[PDB]
Design a protein around this ligand. Sequence first.
Ligand code: NAG
Ligand code: NAG
Ligand code: NAG
Ligand code: NAG
Lengths: 236, 236
Amino acid sequence: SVSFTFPNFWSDVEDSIIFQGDANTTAGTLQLCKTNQYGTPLQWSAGRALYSDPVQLWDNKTESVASFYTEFTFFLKITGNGPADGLAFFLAPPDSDVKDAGEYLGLFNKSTATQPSKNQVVAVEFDTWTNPNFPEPSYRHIGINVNSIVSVATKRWEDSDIFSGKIATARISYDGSAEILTVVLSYPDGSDYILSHSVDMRQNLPESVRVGISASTGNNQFLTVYILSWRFSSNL
Amino acid sequence: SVSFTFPNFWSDVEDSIIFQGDANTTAGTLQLCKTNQYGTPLQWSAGRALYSDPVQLWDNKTESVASFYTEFTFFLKITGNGPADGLAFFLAPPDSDVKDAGEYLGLFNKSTATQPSKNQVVAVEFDTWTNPNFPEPSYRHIGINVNSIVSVATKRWEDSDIFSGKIATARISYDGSAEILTVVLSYPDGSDYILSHSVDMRQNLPESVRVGISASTGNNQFLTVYILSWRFSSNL
Ligand SMILES: *[C@@H]1O[C@H](CO)[C@@H](O)[C@H](O)[C@H]1NC(C)=O
Ligand SMILES: *[C@@H]1O[C@H](CO)[C@@H](O)[C@H](O)[C@H]1NC(C)=O
Ligand SMILES: *[C@@H]1O[C@H](CO)[C@@H](O)[C@H](O)[C@H]1NC(C)=O
Ligand SMILES: *[C@@H]1O[C@H](CO)[C@@H](O)[C@H](O)[C@H]1NC(C)=O
């Protein structure tokens, strides 16, 4: 029963948005991590923007899982060749706070990343990191995660797009009936990515959630992520 | 390996588009069925617009099913209260021609509508008809069809939106890996519809297809459907 539209971020914004970590607005943009005055991205930073109004994912009683659609556009301002880590759209309990930086995208802690029982987060990640010592695919990719840093579904994200210097459009939908989460990543280039997989929102998250977007940086300082717009709609 | 963008239909259009049945352009719009000079919709009409370039759905040899995304906006110009039948996005062999009008949306013939073996068409229908003598749901709805007029997945389409008098956005994606077809129907009102289900493009259609949109009318003359824009992207 929640829907919102942010054509950009020049409005006040802090009514409807909750900023965690480095998260802040920057020129009608949503900037998740912080940068120098010389515009260089700070190391090991995490940031998340959450919509201030909770969403009914499921209802114990009247029993069924909500369906929702979300859309947002972003830009990967990349300088060097070690872009990391990226961003993610996610759902979490209303009181969730930012987590670890690095490949955790401020969604997971270093120690319990793989233990589903100790987590409250379902997300769609857009990863540009390439750390082999981390649970794979091991290459830059788009993935769906359910209370774990090891994705149930992954789709490779070609560098030609990642470093395109173009605005990408992310479309995430969830059919709370067929319980299928779909992710479509579009580039004006025409190139698109479609990723779909089963997710049980009832078994992994509480009845009420907060929807948000987060980013994090690691060692390198070659990446800055900007969210230019974000729309959302849910129905239970 | 095919992608196109029609922000509207004021360009020449007939290079890239193939008009079948009543299909024709009308004021930067795609008008599938014909109307009076008094603008009244003609009875029992069918029309389909097909993209002139074939799409590789699957490849026998190098074996895998393509993934694709499609988007289009439309308007339901409804006068009376018997809007019928609606429109559909679909895939068919390159040489497919328009079929029966009525609840067949120019995609099926009256006699073999339910016999999957005698059909070559996978589609997403947006039905406004309410004929109880027809294979149900029996109420106005959005549905996914695979070589049959009886949908594998259906989602109810509330009248408040159907008769909204607003522009609707249809988003259809297919993950040729997880083999999941998703449909998101959006209204500026915020109201959205998410429908996902399994579809085997390899078993129901030939290697090469034509993507298109079609509409049809029955007895009533209370409906005219317009497609304002249509973008598409496929990758095998
Ligand atoms: C956002 O950044 C500005 C500087 O551009 C600062 O003045 C403000 O306090 C910050 N607000 C939040 C919520 O981080
Ligand atoms: C998780 O990481 C955050 C941020 O570093 C920290 O404040 C919190 O205490 C950590 N929680 C656990 C269980 O490690
Ligand atoms: C389309 O309709 C116009 C009238 O508006 C007509 O002149 C033209 O021949 C038609 N073309 C096709 C392909 O139907
Ligand atoms: C299907 O319907 C079309 C349009 O009415 C017709 O031309 C065609 O011959 C029909 N085919 C069959 C097998 O009935």
